[PDB]
Amino acid sequence: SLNAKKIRLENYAMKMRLYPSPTQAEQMDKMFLALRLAYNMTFHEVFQQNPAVCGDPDEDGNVWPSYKKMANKTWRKALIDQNPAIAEAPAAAITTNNGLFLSNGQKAWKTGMHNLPANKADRKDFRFYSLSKPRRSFAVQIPPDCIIPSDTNQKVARIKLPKIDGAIKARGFNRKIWFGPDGKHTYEEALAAHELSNNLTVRVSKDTCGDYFICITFSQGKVKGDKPTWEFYQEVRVSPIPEPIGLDVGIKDIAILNTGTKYENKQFKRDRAATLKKMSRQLSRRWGPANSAFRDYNKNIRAENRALEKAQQDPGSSGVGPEAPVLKSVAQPSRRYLTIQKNRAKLERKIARRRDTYYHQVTAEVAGKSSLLAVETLRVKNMLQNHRLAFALSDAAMSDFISKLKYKARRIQVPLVINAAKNILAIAQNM
DNA sequence: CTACTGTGTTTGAAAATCCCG
DNA sequence: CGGGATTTTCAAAC
RNA sequence: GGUGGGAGGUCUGUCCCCACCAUGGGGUGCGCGCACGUCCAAACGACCAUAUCAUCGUUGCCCUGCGACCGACGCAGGCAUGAUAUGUAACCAUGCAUUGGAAAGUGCAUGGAGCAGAAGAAACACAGUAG
Numbered sequence: 001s002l003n004a005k006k007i008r009l010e011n012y013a014m015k016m017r018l019y020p021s022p023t024q025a026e027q028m029d030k031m032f033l034a035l036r037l038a039y040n041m042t043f044h045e046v047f048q049q050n051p052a053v054c055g056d057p058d059e060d061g062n063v064w065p066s067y068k069k070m071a072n073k074t075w076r077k078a079l080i081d082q083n084p085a086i087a088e089a090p091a092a093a094i095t096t097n098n099g100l101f102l103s104n105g106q107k108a109w110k111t112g113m114h115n116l117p118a119n120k121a122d123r124k125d126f127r128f129y130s131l132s133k134p135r136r137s138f139a140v141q142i143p144p145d146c147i148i149p150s151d152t153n154q155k156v157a158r159i160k161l162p163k164i165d166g167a168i169k170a171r172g173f174n175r176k177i178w179f180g181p182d183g184k185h186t187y188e189e190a191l192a193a194h195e196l197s198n199n200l201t202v203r204v205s206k207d208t209c210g211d212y213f214i215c216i217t218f219s220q221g222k223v224k225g226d227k228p229t230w231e232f233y234q235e236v237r238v239s240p241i242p243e244p245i246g247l248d249v250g251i252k253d254i255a256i257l258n259t260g261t262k263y264e265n266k267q268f269k270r271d272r273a274a275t276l277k278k279m280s281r282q283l284s285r286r287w288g289p290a291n292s293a294f295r296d297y298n299k300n301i302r303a304e305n306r307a308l309e310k311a312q313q314d315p316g317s318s319g320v321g322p323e324a325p326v327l328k329s330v331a332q333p334s335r336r337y338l339t340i341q342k343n344r345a346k347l348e349r350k351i352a353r354r355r356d357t358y359y360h361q362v363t364a365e366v367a368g369k370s371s372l373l374a375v376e377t378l379r380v381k382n383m384l385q386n387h388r389l390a391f392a393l394s395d396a397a398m399s400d401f402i403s404k405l406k407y408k409a410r411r412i413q414v415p416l417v418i419n420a421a422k423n424i425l426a427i428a429q430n431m
Numbered sequence: 432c433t434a435c436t437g438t439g440t441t442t443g444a445a446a447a448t449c450c451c452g
Numbered sequence: 453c454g455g456g457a458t459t460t461t462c463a464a465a466c
Numbered sequence: 467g468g469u470g471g472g473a474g475g476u477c478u479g480u481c482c483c484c485a486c487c488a489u490g491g492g493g494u495g496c497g498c499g500c501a502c503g504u505c506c507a508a509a510c511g512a513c514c515a516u517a518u519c520a521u522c523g524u525u526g527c528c529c530u531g532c533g534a535c536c537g538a539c540g541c542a543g544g545c546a547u548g549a550u551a552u553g554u555a556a557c558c559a560u561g562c563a564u565u566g567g568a569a570a571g572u573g574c575a576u577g578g579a580g581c582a583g584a585a586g587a588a589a590c591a592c593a594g595u596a597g
Binding site for chain 2: 012013110132139200201219380381
Binding site: 013339404 | 470471474475476477510511549550551552574575576577578579584585586587588589590591592593595596597
């Protein structure tokens with residue numbers, strides 16, 4: 001009963017939790033920043049139609065940026081020459097197929113800017129990288145020899161990363177996954193038996209709070225015949241005798257089953273709505289940004305800064321020492337702002353994290369019991385017409401639940417399509 | 432005015448070049 | 453001075 | 467004993483640890499006490515400490531005196547209410563320097579980190595919404 005049956009994974013991403021050293025964390029942050037500068041400068045230059053970064057002209061004169069050319073060593077060399085602070089990102093994170101230009105920029109231009117020529121396209125529509133949307137990720141390639149799990153502990157890895165010395169300790173090593181021809185090996189067994197891909201992708205990210213993670217993408221190479229290039233398995237639990245289940249959605253519950261069991265969404269927002277709201281108004285009048293009193297203050301300071309620099313540069317001819325230049329800065333938020341900013345970030349990550357874990361648990365207990373899902377809709381726009389659930393949807397996210405159910409019904413290969421729930425299941429059986 | 436959410440898209444392999452014991 | 457680690461190329465374009 | 471939280475990848479409880487409030491009052495039993503069970507009260511992203519800022523009667527009072535009207539106005543003072551900044555919170559062990567003749571911390575470098583029950587697909591992009 002409830003046997004841990006192995007499943008063949010099409011892909012994976014071992015989301016773990018790195019514990020870097022202070023200096024190593026600083027280096028990783030510098031790497032994020034260098035990627036940000038690369039993205040900003042390259043896409044700042046693509047709009048001046050620069051053929052050194054843009055592709056070739058057309059029969060009608062149209063030009064798009066070419067991304068096979070941004071993965072050449074020549075433009076990367078030009079970027080390193082322009083500023084050195086960009087030299088710190090790994091070339092595998094910029095030039096390879098999962099890099100800063102062949103993965104981010106490709107989707108960014110192909111969807112955000114609707115795939116239209118770079119001379120007919122605007123600059124205010126493109127969203128650059130800044131504090132609102134920073135670059136908190138990089139995808140480099142390492143061999144399995146840099147993934148050496150801790151011998152004593154069944155949850156501690158030891159990950160070595162490029163340009164990085166120290167072999168990160170990555171807690172949370174998912175040891176529910178087994179490698180080999182039939183998934184009967186540990187990690188060391190497959191590493192020694194040479195059953196692991198020589199170049200595996202890792203994505204170090206830094207979340208809203210200062211917290212560095214990793215996502216190792218165990219992934220089969222090709223689909224030649226019925227045999228993937230590499231194979232690895234995960235063990236999951238299923239009810240001993242599954243039966244068809246028509247899931248139902250209510251007002252005060254997160255999910256209702258046709259059998260009778262119901263899971264209650266404990267409203268993680270409203271219970272902490274008071275503290276979230278008080279912290280929100282708290283930051284609203286602190287020393288930092290998002291204050292409307294010092295945002296305008298620093299915008300002003302920047303305004304007279306550029307005004308005075310213009311007045312001293314050209315009219316003053318900038319000979320040697322004209323007048324007495326004062327530069328100041330855009331000012332920094334004070335720590336008492338940072339402490340409550342981080343506290344609110346921690347609280348809201350904890351709230352969404354409780355939501356995610358609750359949905360994980362509920363989906364796990366509903367996935368095994370159901371051999372055929374009968375959900376109504378995969379989308380939110382097909383249930384907002386009546387607006388009855390909008391009040392519940394304000395604090396409860398149906399999309400996370402729907403996506404989790406959708407992909408977890410695929411691991412068991414379960415096809416996806418109380419009285420009302422039973423009627424829904426009967427209709428699903430009919431069609 | 433920041434901060435969170437619904438929806439779509441991805442997810443290497445092998446040489447060639449460089450360099451601290 | 454040399455195996456291994458870092459970099460580059462694989463490869464087209466609304 | 468309850469409330470909020472910090473590390474052990476995530477959730478609950480516990481383990482360790484930090485800041486707080488009840489030692490109360492009430493529906494009914496039995497022998498001044500026992501509550502078999504629920505009820506209300508507190509304490510909510512800290513805590514103090516430091517100096518510097520509310521404003522429309524504000525933050526209300528003390529009304530410490532002062533001036534003037536016929537219960538009400540203004541002037542010079544304080545209280546803790548709130549909010550702006552800084553020294554400042556959350557497991558254990560080792561190694562280096564310092565605080566101390568010690569005890570115990572400080573700053574740095576590491577190392578390790580459950581137990582009980584559940585689960586563990588992440589990154590990017592682009593809209594829109596909440597506050």
